[PDB]
Design an enzyme around this catalytic site. Structure first.
Site, PDB file in Angstrom:
ATOM      1  N   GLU A 183      -5.577  77.991 101.405  1.00  0.00           N
ATOM      2  CA  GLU A 183      -6.608  78.225 102.405  1.00  0.00           C
ATOM      3  C   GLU A 183      -6.224  79.448 103.236  1.00  0.00           C
ATOM      4  O   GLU A 183      -5.051  79.611 103.583  1.00  0.00           O
ATOM      5  CB  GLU A 183      -6.738  76.990 103.296  1.00  0.00           C
ATOM      6  CG  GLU A 183      -7.261  75.742 102.570  1.00  0.00           C
ATOM      7  CD  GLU A 183      -8.765  75.773 102.355  1.00  0.00           C
ATOM      8  OE1 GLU A 183      -9.411  76.779 102.718  1.00  0.00           O
ATOM      9  OE2 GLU A 183      -9.312  74.785 101.822  1.00  0.00           O
ATOM     10  N   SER A 223     -10.771  67.461 106.109  1.00  0.00           N
ATOM     11  CA  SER A 223     -10.709  68.646 105.269  1.00  0.00           C
ATOM     12  C   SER A 223      -9.839  69.738 105.909  1.00  0.00           C
ATOM     13  O   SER A 223     -10.146  70.933 105.837  1.00  0.00           O
ATOM     14  CB  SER A 223     -12.123  69.158 105.007  1.00  0.00           C
ATOM     15  OG  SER A 223     -12.134  69.957 103.854  1.00  0.00           O
ATOM     16  N   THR A 248     -15.293  66.122 100.108  1.00  0.00           N
ATOM     17  CA  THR A 248     -16.176  67.278 100.024  1.00  0.00           C
ATOM     18  C   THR A 248     -15.407  68.595  99.998  1.00  0.00           C
ATOM     19  O   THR A 248     -14.203  68.645 100.264  1.00  0.00           O
ATOM     20  CB  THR A 248     -17.133  67.335 101.238  1.00  0.00           C
ATOM     21  OG1 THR A 248     -16.372  67.286 102.455  1.00  0.00           O
ATOM     22  CG2 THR A 248     -18.105  66.164 101.209  1.00  0.00           C
ATOM     23  N   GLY A 249     -16.123  69.664  99.679  1.00  0.00           N
ATOM     24  CA  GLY A 249     -15.612  71.013  99.825  1.00  0.00           C
ATOM     25  C   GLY A 249     -16.776  71.980  99.910  1.00  0.00           C
ATOM     26  O   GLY A 249     -17.779  71.827  99.203  1.00  0.00           O
ATOM     27  N   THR A 250     -16.660  72.956 100.800  1.00  0.00           N
ATOM     28  CA  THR A 250     -17.620  74.040 100.860  1.00  0.00           C
ATOM     29  C   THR A 250     -16.835  75.333 100.945  1.00  0.00           C
ATOM     30  O   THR A 250     -15.661  75.326 101.279  1.00  0.00           O
ATOM     31  CB  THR A 250     -18.556  73.935 102.085  1.00  0.00           C
ATOM     32  OG1 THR A 250     -17.781  74.013 103.285  1.00  0.00           O
ATOM     33  CG2 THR A 250     -19.339  72.625 102.076  1.00  0.00           C
ATOM     34  N   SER A 293     -12.497  72.660  99.157  1.00  0.00           N
ATOM     35  CA  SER A 293     -11.622  71.637  99.703  1.00  0.00           C
ATOM     36  C   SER A 293     -11.461  70.390  98.834  1.00  0.00           C
ATOM     37  O   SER A 293     -10.677  69.505  99.187  1.00  0.00           O
ATOM     38  CB  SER A 293     -12.093  71.226 101.091  1.00  0.00           C
ATOM     39  OG  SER A 293     -11.865  72.266 102.024  1.00  0.00           O
TER      40      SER A 293
END
Length: 265
Positions: free
Chosen positions: A140, A100, A209-211, A42
């Site tokens: 996504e 996100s 952030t991104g996961t 993200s």
């Protein structure tokens, strides 16, 4: 030293860790695996919003975007609440950064337009900022899923840090669009346990952030010391050793950031 701290964190979390902080007036660049590719996850959503801001007049933010059930295909804490009414571009930007929101991001990609549902144009936006490394190939949720080592949907800590530096600190955007982007990252709701956790409370932190799968956890931030000195901090990680279902471990980012903060203080 710092490289030893980072290597220790890698062993602790069974992880691959990447760190970049660009050089400043008085500090040398901090780099650890900084030119290795890591999935964006993200984190792309922040420069995506910049792309959309850059491409349009400010009042494009007020354009209503409609969408439906089959558009909700990824974690989208805000877009799922507004499917019946639609969301303005501004709301989509807000959601994409602060929550996100994946549907918001896919819609912003489509707003940017062109091949790959907007992914080519997104990549083109990064090229215009001199980033010849990053590539966005999917939207996504697919972008979180490339096998470890695959170059699709990847950036490097070095590349993304220089991009963010230009967006927030530099002149890639006019001041009024720059402030919008900065304010959104400043009001981010998902980053409390990442880079924010490693810097003292009197430092300002804005971030995205991104996961993703394979234990992917990233955070890109701009931080300001209590005297207003800014640093860009990119920290990226994956845990391929755990396979697809490996848990993202934001504690790793917090610890790396704490190590960075100790050097920058």
């Amino acid at each position: 030293d710092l490289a030893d701290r980072f290597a220790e964190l890698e062993r602790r979390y069974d992880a691959r860790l990447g760190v970049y902080v660009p050089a400043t007036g008085t500090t040398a660049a901090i780099e650890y695996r900084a030119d290795e590719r890591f999935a964006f996850c993200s984190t792309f959503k922040a420069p995506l919003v910049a792309a959309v801001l850059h491409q349009n007049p400010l009042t494009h933010l007020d354009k209503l975007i409609t969408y439906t059930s089959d558009d909700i295909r990824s974690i989208s804490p805000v877009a799922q609440q507004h499917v019946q009414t639609g969301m303005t571009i501004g709301q989509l930007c807000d959601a994409a950064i602060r929550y996100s929101d994946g549907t918001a991001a896919n819609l912003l990609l489509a707003d940017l337009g062109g091949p790959g549902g907007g992914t080519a144009a997104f990549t083109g936006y990064l090229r215009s900022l001199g980033d010849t490394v990053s590539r966005l190939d999917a939207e996504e949720p697919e972008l979180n899923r490339d096998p470890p080592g695959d170059e699709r949907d990847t950036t490097t800590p070095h590349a993304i840090a220089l991009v963010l530096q230009q967006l927030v600190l530099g002149n890639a955007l006019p001041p009024d669009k720059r402030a919008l982007l900065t304010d959104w990252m400043a009001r981010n709701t998902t980053g409390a346990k990442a880079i924010r956790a490693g810097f003292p409370a009197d430092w300002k932190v804005i971030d995205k952030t991104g996961t993703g799968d394979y234990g992917r956890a990233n955070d890109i931030a701009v931080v300001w010391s209590p005297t207003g000195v800014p640093y860009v901090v990119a920290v990226m990680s994956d845990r391929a050793g755990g396979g697809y279902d490996a848990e993202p471990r934001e504690a790793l980012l917090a610890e790396a950031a704490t190590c960075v903060a100790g050097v920058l203080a």
